[PDB]
Amino acid sequence: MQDAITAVINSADVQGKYLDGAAMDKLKSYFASGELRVRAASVISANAATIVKEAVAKSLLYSDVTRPGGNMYTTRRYAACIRDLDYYLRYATYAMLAGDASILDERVLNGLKETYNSLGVPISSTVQAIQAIKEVTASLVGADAGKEMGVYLDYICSGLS
Amino acid sequence: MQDAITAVINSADVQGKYLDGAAMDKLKSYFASGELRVRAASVISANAATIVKEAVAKSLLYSDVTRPGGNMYTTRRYAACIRDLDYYLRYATYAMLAGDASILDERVLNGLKETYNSLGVPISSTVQAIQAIKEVTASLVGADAGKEMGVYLDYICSGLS
Amino acid sequence: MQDAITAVINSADVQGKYLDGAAMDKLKSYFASGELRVRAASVISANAATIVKEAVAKSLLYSDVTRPGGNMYTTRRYAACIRDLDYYLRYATYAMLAGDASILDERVLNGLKETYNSLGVPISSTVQAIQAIKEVTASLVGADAGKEMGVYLDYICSGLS
Amino acid sequence: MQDAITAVINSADVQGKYLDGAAMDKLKSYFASGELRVRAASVISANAATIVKEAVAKSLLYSDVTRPGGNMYTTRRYAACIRDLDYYLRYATYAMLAGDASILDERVLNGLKETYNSLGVPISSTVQAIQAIKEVTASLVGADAGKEMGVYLDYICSGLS
Amino acid sequence: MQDAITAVINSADVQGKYLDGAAMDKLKSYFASGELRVRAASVISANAATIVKEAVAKSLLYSDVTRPGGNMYTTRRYAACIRDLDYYLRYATYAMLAGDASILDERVLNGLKETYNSLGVPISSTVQAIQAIKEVTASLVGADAGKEMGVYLDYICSGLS
Amino acid sequence: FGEDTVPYERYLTPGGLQMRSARVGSLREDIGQRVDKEVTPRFVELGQV
Amino acid sequence: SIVTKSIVNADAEARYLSPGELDRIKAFVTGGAARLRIAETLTGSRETIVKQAGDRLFQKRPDIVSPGGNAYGEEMTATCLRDMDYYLRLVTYGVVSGDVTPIEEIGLVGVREMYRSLGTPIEAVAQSVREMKEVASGLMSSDDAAEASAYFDFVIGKMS
Amino acid sequence: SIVTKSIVNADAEARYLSPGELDRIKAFVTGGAARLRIAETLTGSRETIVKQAGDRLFQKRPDIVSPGGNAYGEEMTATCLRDMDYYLRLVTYGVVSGDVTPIEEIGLVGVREMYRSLGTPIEAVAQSVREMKEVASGLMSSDDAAEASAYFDFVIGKMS
Amino acid sequence: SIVTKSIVNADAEARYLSPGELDRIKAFVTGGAARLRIAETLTGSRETIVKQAGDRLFQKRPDIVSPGGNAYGEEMTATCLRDMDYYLRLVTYGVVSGDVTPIEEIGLVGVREMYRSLGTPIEAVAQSVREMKEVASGLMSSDDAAEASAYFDFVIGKMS
Amino acid sequence: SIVTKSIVNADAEARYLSPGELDRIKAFVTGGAARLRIAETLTGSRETIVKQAGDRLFQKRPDIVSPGGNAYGEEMTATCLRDMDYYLRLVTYGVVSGDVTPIEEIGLVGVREMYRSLGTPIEAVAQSVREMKEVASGLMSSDDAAEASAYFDFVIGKMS
Amino acid sequence: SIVTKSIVNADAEARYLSPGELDRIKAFVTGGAARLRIAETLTGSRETIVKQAGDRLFQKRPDIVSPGGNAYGEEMTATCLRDMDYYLRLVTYGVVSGDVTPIEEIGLVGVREMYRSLGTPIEAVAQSVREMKEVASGLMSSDDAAEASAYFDFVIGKMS
Ligand SMILES: *[C@@H](C)[C@H]1/C(=C/c2[nH]c(/C=C3N=C(/C=C4\NC(=O)C(CC)=C4C)C(C)=C\3CCC(=O)O)c(CCC(=O)O)c2C)NC(=O)[C@@H]1C
Ligand SMILES: *[C@H](C)[C@H]1/C(=C/c2[nH]c(/C=C3N=C(/C=C4\NC(=O)C(CC)=C4C)C(C)=C\3CCC(=O)O)c(CCC(=O)O)c2C)NC(=O)[C@@H]1C
Ligand SMILES: *[C@H](C)[C@H]1/C(=C/c2[nH]c(/C=C3N=C(/C=C4\NC(=O)C(CC)=C4C)C(C)=C\3CCC(=O)O)c(CCC(=O)O)c2C)NC(=O)[C@@H]1C
């Protein structure tokens, strides 16, 4: 995986040049936003379960999917759906801390669409669930870091689509 | 698609021999059932729209599916649901006439889960709609021919599973 | 695709409600911004190719991308990249006129990242070219309308990166 | 392991002879007792958590071993101790269903004493804890199977002491 | 393993008491010596290979062990010996950064005496090598950091002997 | 198409439609999500004069 | 909307929008205040239009609410008035959008098949929409009535 | 501790400490005076914090002291306050050590099995230590409360 | 970086990052200006350090430029100075990253096999990086010299 | 089912079905009529079992239905009765199948995680299943009550 | 307002305002920005305060929403939450005005007689405003929480 530091290092390295100020300002901006990322990650790590709880309550509960015949009908499939949303929230927290969406398409997205197509998982329903996660964590954390979290959540949705 | 006759001819043809006595017994069993199959197909083909009307009134109407926010709300989606139930009734009649579910495996269940997941179609609600079709058809035609229709309707349901 | 009016109408339809006060406020805001959207669309439709040609002069020319071994080396590949930036500018103009990114998601970003990964197109260089388009359009159009165009071009950057 | 029914089979295997009456009557006694053994095993399987809870409550609770300075003070030590008690109850259930203590001699009494000496686990505390296991099981089932449970628990006492 | 702060925290937890001055004096001593330990570890990691080569030059070269028939003759054996020596140096650096020698007497001295007695490695010659390492580090990093290294190094000597 | 009609995209694969309409934009609120009819609360309605 | 229609046409042509289409969007943007006024009047008087037009419908076509009719009963009459309120809401959507596109997307495609499956007379639904048009045209100003009558007569023509 | 986790990472990768983690240990050493100051004020207020937090806990959830709760009786409430005192001691231990490792290896893993065998509501004791962190953040200064609240919220997350 | 290390370790343990790593991350974030300053100092003196250290290496050990040597030839010495520029660039990468992972992932894995193939003496490469360390430490301030020489001795320790 | 377990146990050691498995399957077949009778009276009395057991549950545990509780409100009460009907249906499935693996595969894997996400007290759900056990055991003969209470007590053990 | 109090005192004395009183409006003017910030915080967080305070009030006093209670129905519960919204608006008025005069003049004179006529438990109204104070102090900073809780405690003292 790559964070913003390794991203700008490899961007300098692929052209083989040293660090210029047009690259050093990227590291300065990342160190400006780092404490915001750390505090938002601490809030999300403290409140990881309740984000998923109110997200499923906002989006997936009392819908077609929990009814008999739905994809999250049995308790095994419900626990698998909660596990998937925990995966999405934790890896989006990782991407928010890194400041680069490399871990998302390098450890979540590279085959998950094929896996969901083989399992019959509703990708649009998972996208709506991740949007519910985004609204809950935006209300919980704040607008400034919630936007950065929502960028990687929409990255996860775009990889899923 | 394969009926019982083409299934017997296929099983003899891949052996390269003619029809032996067990093949004759299977054909005579199918010819014995063919009277009931033709009568049930005639009754369903006559009262095709009434079965869909009764099933939609039984299972889908005056619910959140047909209310605003549901997937049967917009009238193009309502007419699409009517067309889908006519699809299920007509291909279940085809599978009853054939005595085999290969027609459902080839044209009905071919990516239907992926299609409904991409569209956002409620799998649980359409399974309940096919169940209402099964109950209305079993009420209309009888116990034995209704059970014969219900075998392929439950096959469509388990394909949607 | 949807514009701002179509998005408001769709939200009110999904709620099953008439146009309340807040929906009329959003409609009045869009009707207020429509003058600036029309003027910006006319200015960009005038200076369509000019934005692209100093954008590639600012971002892409005289680099290893243009030099042999680069992805924009041949005249065919150069015309392909010029056409791609023309499409990006035209669709950002469409999104700025509509007030929504629905056309960007429907007709640009669907499979665009997979297309560029299959072709080997540099994502970072393409993003920097779109940033050059954003800077030239902001310098040429104005402040608020240039900021709106920058918002939709950054949406294209977020969907592509 | 080997059961009570297989015990006479193994003894006759060593002797190289068939079943004799001094083992026939023991096998008939096991056949007469086996229904109350299997039902008492079913009862303690249904109420298995209550035995561990009451044993911890009336033997190990509010003691030197669970106060600071004790070998069962910390939460990890408590979880390990209740897991050990649950395993003791499950293997005692296995023996009282099976009619033999070979399951305890092989799958419990292999090196448990030496691991407890390695860990510094209080042997006398475990011995009074399995006395509490005896009292709770005898209260739950009754003395008719309580003495039968106490035979294998006294086997545990002799093995661990 | 157990460093200084976890050691005093465990000593407090055995008595079940909050941290008082009788451990906080040693805690202030550790935090006063911490930057000395880090700078000494930096110097030792800077000169880590040179310490080993001067130690083997001043204690182990031109001896009966590196004569044929000795305990350091073959090339694999010499590589293993210098591997042991910079293992001892690096784990002594670990204990010197930690403030306690739990890592030294556990993850180095678990079975080191027994395996050296089985192999035939001269314990006295290894003690002389460790004393040579101690003299080189004391002459290279200073007096106070040198004797702090020497405490853990003759702790290693006492573990070997 | 007749002799005068340019061909046009008539049918899609489900995967292609999912790529087009399963992104963050251009996806409706009622596709795979329960839509709760939000309303002004009854106490706010009573508090309005 | 007409903005959506112009953007769709320009996208099909793969070009920027023609200045005639820019002037169309300009004219719609300037004239949207009157459209919002029409939609506000219909939204405010949504209940009396439905009630009076339902009464005029049931007097003109007594068969649909007599016993044996499709809308006989209080709950069936409530469902019929709910359908009329739905169509008036779609008329407000079309007035706001400036074109018949949301009306056709939400409530005209498959309407024939839907009402044929329900057994409801589509001609009587068209008569209900016609009475709603008459009551709304009586309730608003004449230029506003002429503007709303285009969308109303679109619904009439697509039902008939 | 953070020093022992640094050397665990170091000998897991089987080499000496990196300069970044050496400067990180330097930063931990320099901040350890502030963490020890937090330790002094917490061990000075070790009684009033746990007493006010227990009073807030019984005021929030009266069903604990009501019949049907686990902590019914004077010895039961004394053991509940003793558990809260142990967890406050663990939070002070973590503030001293610089990481959540002592809380994890003393009283935070296996707490589900602990309170399942006890019958104690895990959300109720999470609420109790939440009131502990609120009273602690009230009594601390802003930077000290911000430092201790991360470890407190880790206790909340792993004991919720 | 340390962010990448902590996220990778928490991912392998399938858990969120604890505050015991989050405080380390925010400390690395806050203490970045010194590393940035050392980075622009090194890339300002990127040429002269390479020139002086190459001059010192070829005067200290003339076997490199001896006939039959590995770098006998003007283009061979040019590629040797280019390798010195490469490792100075990697040292600047490690300085601006605050970690040894960029040097390890770019120019330390397979270096022994690479120079074992090419015949270039690995101890003379270590001497080259050591001489760059001495020139840079002479060129810059003493605490910054120690900070840069930390990564420099990491490189020469992985070399030998 | 028992047939499934016997075939799986034979196939795992790659042989045909043993005489012990044939005797077990024969016992399953002979007890099929009694098991079918138990399942038939359960599904015939499925409404009154859920009604009476829900009434007894809500009398014995008013906290889950009082305000602030998980099931407070008519919709949440109906959802709780729906969950009880779901578990009664799974009990009938287990009674038909002769073992506990349909109940395990449908409604007893991830049940703790699901109800923890829902906020529902799993011990109160176990109390609901215990009341269903008592009400259903009062509606049959003694051997039938014991046979059904075996599957009921399996659900009790999996919930608590 | 304190300017109204000082001008009433000066007018009843028939004189001009003393320099101490001019300092009263002076310091009131200086504190006006912070008072407006507190009132704007409450106004922005209006509905959340009322909903959480209502839920916690109904949790602590289940009898008022039980059948036979004063607020059993949904409309009566809405009247409860409406009274709460009234008192929250009065608290914001008092925060803006800098004194308890608008709260007392609008909704605290004759409140006992009004709620006795309505059959409403005045102590449960006091508990409801106490829960409102708790939620406001939860989502407000501590000094501003004390500033709002002064007016909240005035309301509680007038109810009790
Ligand atoms: C001369 C052209 C080259 C050279 C040689 C050189 N070697 C040493 C010292 C030692 N070499 C060994 C190696 C071995 N001993 C063994 O028994 C075996 C396997 C059979 C090997 C490979 C050892 C152990 C030493 C240390 C002396 C000892 O034996 O105790 C030196 C001396 C260096 C010193 O500092 O004393 C020298 C000079 N050096 C070169 O540059 C030429 C390539
Ligand atoms: C060198 C100081 C003296 C010497 C020693 C000698 N060592 C070996 C090989 C081994 N060294 C170790 C030690 C460790 N392995 C670990 O993982 C750790 C913890 C970090 C330690 C301390 C071990 C276990 C061996 C055994 C085999 C191996 O290579 O791993 C040998 C070789 C024995 C053989 O020939 O089989 C020798 C001789 N001998 C001397 O004379 C030096 C004074
Ligand atoms: C009233 C003018 C006429 C009439 C109406 C009538 N309609 C129904 C039933 C339904 N009609 C619809 C149609 C729509 N749903 C939509 O979302 C829209 C566009 C916004 C339309 C037009 C639907 C879905 C139903 C089903 C009701 C449900 O929600 O489940 C009935 C009831 C028929 C029945 O058998 O229940 C009636 C009576 N009937 C007349 O005679 C008038 C001509």
Ligand SMILES: *[C@H](C)[C@H]1/C(=C/c2[nH]c(/C=C3N=C(/C=C4\NC(=O)C(CC)=C4C)C(C)=C\3CCC(=O)O)c(CCC(=O)O)c2C)NC(=O)[C@@H]1C
């Ligand atoms: C108080 C916040 C809540 C609660 C308390 C309660 N505690 C007990 C008794 C025990 N609690 C523990 C737990 C620990 N001991 C440790 O050393 C540690 C780690 C530091 C923990 C987490 C233990 C072991 C006991 C048993 C006492 C003993 O050591 O023998 C009880 C009594 C249980 C009973 O049934 O008697 C209670 C009630 N309950 C609540 O409702 C409060 C929310």
Ligand SMILES: *[C@H](C)[C@H]1/C(=C/c2[nH]c(/C=C3N=C(/C=C4\NC(=O)C(CC)=C4C)C(C)=C\3CCC(=O)O)c(CCC(=O)O)c2C)NC(=O)[C@@H]1C
């Ligand atoms: C009743 C005994 C207890 C209780 C119940 C309660 N349940 C819910 C909500 C849900 N429960 C489930 C669980 C299942 N779905 C299945 O398909 C199966 C197995 C067949 C199970 C066990 C689900 C999915 C829901 C969500 C509703 C939905 O259909 O989407 C609630 C509501 C909680 C909420 O926040 O909505 C309640 C109250 N509560 C009690 O107090 C009793 C102990």
Ligand SMILES: CCC1=C(C)/C(=C/C2=NC(=C\c3[nH]c(/C=C4\NC(=O)[C@H](C)[C@H]4CC)c(C)c3CCC(=O)O)/C(CCC(=O)O)=C2C)NC1=O
């Ligand atoms: C192998 C196929 C191939 C072609 C054809 C090619 C063309 C090419 N010509 C360029 C520029 C240019 N080309 C010219 C050349 C000319 N101006 C004139 O007036 C003369 C008429 C004419 C040449 C006879 C100039 C002046 C520029 C620079 C334009 C600018 O920078 O504004 C550039 C951009 C500069 C760059 O390389 O980064 C490219 C890519 N590249 C390729 O890989």
